[PDB]
Each structure stands twice: as C-alpha cells, then as structure tokens.
Design an enzyme around this catalytic site. Structure first.
Site, short mmCIF file in Angstrom:
data_model
loop_
_atom_site.label_atom_id
_atom_site.label_comp_id
_atom_site.label_asym_id
_atom_site.label_seq_id
_atom_site.Cartn_x
_atom_site.Cartn_y
_atom_site.Cartn_z
N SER A 1 0.85 -1.18 0.00
CA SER A 1 0.00 0.00 0.00
C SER A 1 0.89 1.22 0.00
CB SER A 1 -0.95 0.11 1.19
OG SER A 1 -1.57 1.40 1.20
N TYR B 1 -1.38 -0.32 10.45
CA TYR B 1 -1.36 -0.58 9.01
C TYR B 1 -0.06 -0.10 8.38
CZ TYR B 1 -3.03 -1.13 4.21
OH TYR B 1 -3.21 -1.53 2.90
#
Length: 291
Positions: A178, A234
């Site tokens: 990501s 994350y």
C-alpha cells in the site's frame, strides 16, 4: 505456454478476485484462497461463469487463514496432492487495523489528510480527527491482528510455499502492499531507520520494530514515541512487509520477488503483470502501479 499454477490469497473479492480473473484467462491454473470457505466457493463460481465453462478446471477454491499455521499447512498439502507444483504466489490477504465509528464516509477525510503528507513530506505526529460525524478507531486488538496478518501471515504463507516454488523454472512472488507503506509516514525515527537499511537488515530487526510498536501501543504511548497517529498498525506492518520483500529477494536470487501498491480490474493489472514477470524483471523493488 508452459502450464503454470498460482495461489492468490484473500481472493474472494476486491483486487485479489480480479487478479484471479486475469491469471485464469491467460491459461494459468489459479487457487483462489480465502478466509471463508463459501465466499471463496461463490467467488470461483462467478469467475468461471464470467470466463466460460471451459475454465472450470483452471480455477480452484481452497480456504486459507494466514494467521493460522494449520490453515497454511493444509493449503500446501492441497497444492501438493492435486498439482505437485507452484509457480506464482500473490500475497493479497490483508487487514487495515481500523474501522469507522459513526458515519463511514468520514474515512475519506482521514485518507485525504494522509495523502497530503505525500505532497508536503511533513509527516504530522499529532492526531487530528477531521469530523465528529465519524471517528477512525484503531483498537489494540486490531493492531495485533493487523500486524499478524499483513506481516507474519504473508511470511508464514511465503515460507510454506517456497519449497514448492523453488521447483519452478520461473518462481514469482508478488506482495500486495500500500501507498501507506512509504517511509514518508514513519514519524518514529528509529523504526524508519531500521526499514531504510539496505545492508545489515535482518528479519529479527524487523520483528523488533513490530514488537516495539505493539508495546508502545499497549502502553498508550503511540504519540509519546512519535508513532503515526492514524493507520498506525497498518503503516508499520506494510512498511515491514516491503522490507521483508527485499530480504527474501536477496535470499532467493533465482526468484523474481516484488511488492506493488495497486476500478479493481485496472488496479489488478500491475500485480498480474508482476506474476507473469519475465525472468529479467527486477526483484526487491516497490512498484506504485507501474514502477
């Protein structure tokens, strides 16, 4: 030309599903692995009806929970006993570490604030919640599950399949990362230091950052210690996964191993191309869509 077999994890929806679609259409035989059995079964059904009944043999569903050694272990036996070979691993299974309280759409305001860190490079360390309509919650348990899936899950699945992959004359491993993996977001300078090392980087050192983050997170010192205010688990786990991608890239030079930040069919194009990467493609690089 040569018959090939691929596993795509977390593949019952989203970009993973489109990866599965695009691999199967190029003659690859795909194992659609998903945390839930029936959703993986239903996803397989839709793919062959969309692709044509002639692909029924090219797509297989198998349940896979990456946090569960026994689930991982069961999958390797399945690939072993049905096919005997594996050529492509796409690690797509992942968790956010976050959910929305209240209005779910306020999430776009949180994501917006993060991407403006890209156009200023100034990584703010103090938490800023854009609205009272909604609130981005990052619980302690979600941080453990998020790290356990994004880092340890991917490593667990990768290490379990390396023995099969190594009998390929072109093994390909693709790690779906990501944009939040970028080190611009690593407000904690030590951890940023670990992740940036190109020489003397070890998995033990990576695991120390993850354990240290989870402990300051338990202690409620996320901000004291300069950890990211939002998407904290994350960012750290996917940054760790990038560093881990480079580690095993150097361990297995005959493999081509890469990470990639990804409508879903177009975003799936970049990881699918890396799964079919020519023998001369790179290894150890983080690609944003197209390089």
């Amino acid at each position: 030309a040569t018959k090939r077999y691929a596993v795509v994890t977390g593949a019952n929806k989203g970009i993973g599903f489109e990866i599965c679609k695009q691999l199967a259409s190029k003659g690859i035989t795909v194992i659609l692995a998903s945390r839930d059995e029936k959703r993986g079964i239903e996803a397989r059904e839709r793919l062959i009806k969309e692709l044509g009944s002639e692909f029924g043999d090219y797509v297989v569903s198998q349940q896979l929970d990456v946090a569960d050694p026994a689930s991982v272990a069961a999958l390797v036996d399945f690939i072993k006993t049905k096919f005997g070979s594996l050529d492509i691993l796409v690690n797509n299974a992942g968790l956010n570490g976050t959910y929305m309280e209240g209005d779910a759409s306020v999430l776009n305001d949180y994501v917006e604030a993060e991407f403006k860190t890209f156009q200023s490079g100034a990584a703010k360390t103090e938490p800023y919640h854009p609205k009272a309509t909604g609130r981005l919650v990052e619980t302690v348990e979600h941080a453990k599950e998020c790290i356990e899936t994004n880092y340890y899950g991917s490593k667990r699945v990768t290490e379990a399949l390396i023995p099969l992959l190594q009998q390929s004359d072109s093994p390909r491993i693709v790690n779906v990362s990501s944009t939040l993996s970028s080190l611009v977001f690593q407000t904690n300078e030590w951890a940023k230091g670990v992740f940036s090392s190109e020489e003397g980087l070890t998995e033990e050192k990576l695991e120390e950052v993850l354990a240290e983050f989870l402990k300051d997170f338990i202690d409620g010192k996320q901000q004291e210690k300069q950890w990211p205010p939002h998407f904290s688990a994350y960012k750290v786990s996917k940054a760790a996964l990038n560093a881990y991608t480079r580690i095993i890239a150097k361990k297995y030079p005959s493999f081509r191993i890469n990470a990639v930040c990804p409508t879903d069919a177009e975003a799936a194009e970049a990881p699918v191309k890396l799964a079919l990467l020519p023998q001369g493609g790179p290894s150890g690089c983080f690609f944003f869509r197209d390089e």
